[PDB]
Design an enzyme around this catalytic site. Structure first.
Site, PDB file in Angstrom:
ATOM      1  N   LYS A   7     -27.098  74.961  27.687  1.00 17.76           N
ATOM      2  CA  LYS A   7     -27.012  76.602  27.594  1.00 17.76           C
ATOM      3  C   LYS A   7     -26.869  77.087  29.000  1.00 17.76           C
ATOM      4  CE  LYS A   7     -29.768  79.831  25.074  1.00 17.76           C
ATOM      5  NZ  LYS A   7     -30.558  81.029  25.606  1.00 17.76           N
ATOM      6  N   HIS A  12     -23.670  80.869  32.142  1.00 13.09           N
ATOM      7  CA  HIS A  12     -24.480  81.074  33.786  1.00 13.09           C
ATOM      8  C   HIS A  12     -23.238  80.745  34.669  1.00 13.09           C
ATOM      9  CE1 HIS A  12     -27.549  83.733  32.636  1.00 13.09           C
ATOM     10  NE2 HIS A  12     -28.406  82.542  32.410  1.00 13.09           N
ATOM     11  N   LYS A  41     -24.625  91.147  23.948  1.00 13.07           N
ATOM     12  CA  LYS A  41     -25.649  90.497  25.543  1.00 13.07           C
ATOM     13  C   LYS A  41     -26.053  91.710  26.672  1.00 13.07           C
ATOM     14  CE  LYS A  41     -27.690  87.441  28.630  1.00 13.07           C
ATOM     15  NZ  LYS A  41     -27.864  85.353  29.120  1.00 13.07           N
ATOM     16  N   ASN A  44     -25.261  90.119  31.611  1.00 16.25           N
ATOM     17  CA  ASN A  44     -25.439  88.772  32.242  1.00 16.25           C
ATOM     18  C   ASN A  44     -25.092  88.621  33.523  1.00 16.25           C
ATOM     19  OD1 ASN A  44     -25.451  85.421  30.824  1.00 16.25           O
ATOM     20  ND2 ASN A  44     -23.266  85.698  31.578  1.00 16.25           N
ATOM     21  N   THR A  45     -25.283  87.356  34.361  1.00 18.25           N
ATOM     22  CA  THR A  45     -24.990  86.550  35.432  1.00 18.25           C
ATOM     23  C   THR A  45     -23.862  85.329  35.556  1.00 18.25           C
ATOM     24  OG1 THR A  45     -26.365  87.727  36.749  1.00 18.25           O
ATOM     25  CG2 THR A  45     -25.018  86.242  38.324  1.00 18.25           C
ATOM     26  N   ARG A  85     -22.308  94.385  32.594  1.00 19.12           N
ATOM     27  CA  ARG A  85     -23.770  95.122  31.991  1.00 19.12           C
ATOM     28  C   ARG A  85     -22.821  95.913  31.303  1.00 19.12           C
ATOM     29  NH1 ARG A  85     -25.319  95.752  38.916  1.00 19.12           N
ATOM     30  NH2 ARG A  85     -26.678  94.432  38.950  1.00 19.12           N
ATOM     31  N   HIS A 119     -32.466  78.408  33.704  1.00 22.67           N
ATOM     32  CA  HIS A 119     -32.475  80.119  33.201  1.00 22.67           C
ATOM     33  C   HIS A 119     -32.249  81.053  34.651  1.00 22.67           C
ATOM     34  CE1 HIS A 119     -34.592  83.875  31.879  1.00 22.67           C
ATOM     35  NE2 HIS A 119     -34.469  84.232  33.535  1.00 22.67           N
ATOM     36  N   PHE A 120     -31.410  82.222  34.395  1.00 25.14           N
ATOM     37  CA  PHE A 120     -31.157  82.655  35.368  1.00 25.14           C
ATOM     38  C   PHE A 120     -32.161  83.726  36.068  1.00 25.14           C
ATOM     39  CE2 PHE A 120     -28.862  85.636  37.565  1.00 25.14           C
ATOM     40  CZ  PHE A 120     -28.419  85.301  38.831  1.00 25.14           C
ATOM     41  N   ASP A 121     -33.128  83.938  36.603  1.00 21.91           N
ATOM     42  CA  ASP A 121     -33.880  84.466  36.829  1.00 21.91           C
ATOM     43  C   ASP A 121     -33.627  86.310  37.989  1.00 21.91           C
ATOM     44  OD1 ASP A 121     -36.095  85.336  35.578  1.00 21.91           O
ATOM     45  OD2 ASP A 121     -37.022  84.939  37.881  1.00 21.91           O
TER      46      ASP A 121
END
Length: 124
Positions: A7, A12, A41, A44-45, A85, A119-121
Site C-alpha cells: 500500500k 507513495h 484523496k 498525497n505525496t 492537492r 505511511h508517509f507522514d
C-alpha cells in the site's frame, strides 16, 4: 490482501520519474494508483527516489509521528517528491489536483519485520 508495505509503494512511490512529469501528473497518478476510487484523496505525496533509498529511511533520524506514535523517521538527505492537492473545482468522480514538485526531507512511519515504510507522514 494488500500488505501495508505494498500500500505504501502504491500510494507513495514513483521512482520511474526524477520529478513531477507535468501539471497533469497528479490527475493521472491519483487515478492510476487507485486513490480516487471511493473518494478524491484530498492530499498525497509521491517520492521519485529508489525503493532502496526510501526503505533506508527506516534506519535514519527517529522523530515523533503526527499521530504521537514513535516509529517515524526523517531522511538525512533531501529527496525528489511531488505533492498532490485537490483543487476547489474538483468534484468526485472527476478528482482534480494541483501538482507541486519539491526537494525536501521526508518523514515516513515504519513497521514490521522486515522494518519497512508503511505511511508517509510529512515532508520538511
Amino acid at each position: 490482501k494488500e500488505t501495508a508495505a505494498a500500500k505504501f509503494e502504491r500510494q507513495h512511490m514513483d521512482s520511474s520519474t526524477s520529478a513531477a512529469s507535468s501539471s497533469n501528473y497528479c490527475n493521472q497518478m491519483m487515478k492510476s494508483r487507485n486513490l480516487t476510487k471511493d473518494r478524491c484523496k484530498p492530499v498525497n505525496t509521491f517520492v521519485h527516489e529508489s525503493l532502496a533509498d526510501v526503505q533506508a529511511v527506516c534506519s535514519q533520524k527517529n522523530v515523533a509521528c503526527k499521530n504521537g506514535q514513535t516509529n517515524c523517521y526523517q531522511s538525512y538527505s533531501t529527496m525528489s517528491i511531488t505533492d498532490c492537492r485537490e483543487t476547489g473545482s474538483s468534484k468526485y468522480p472527476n478528482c482534480a489536483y494541483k501538482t507541486t514538485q519539491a526537494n525536501k526531507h521526508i518523514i515516513v512511519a515504519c513497521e514490521g519485520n522486515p522494518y519497512v515504510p508503511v505511511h508517509f507522514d510529512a515532508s520538511v
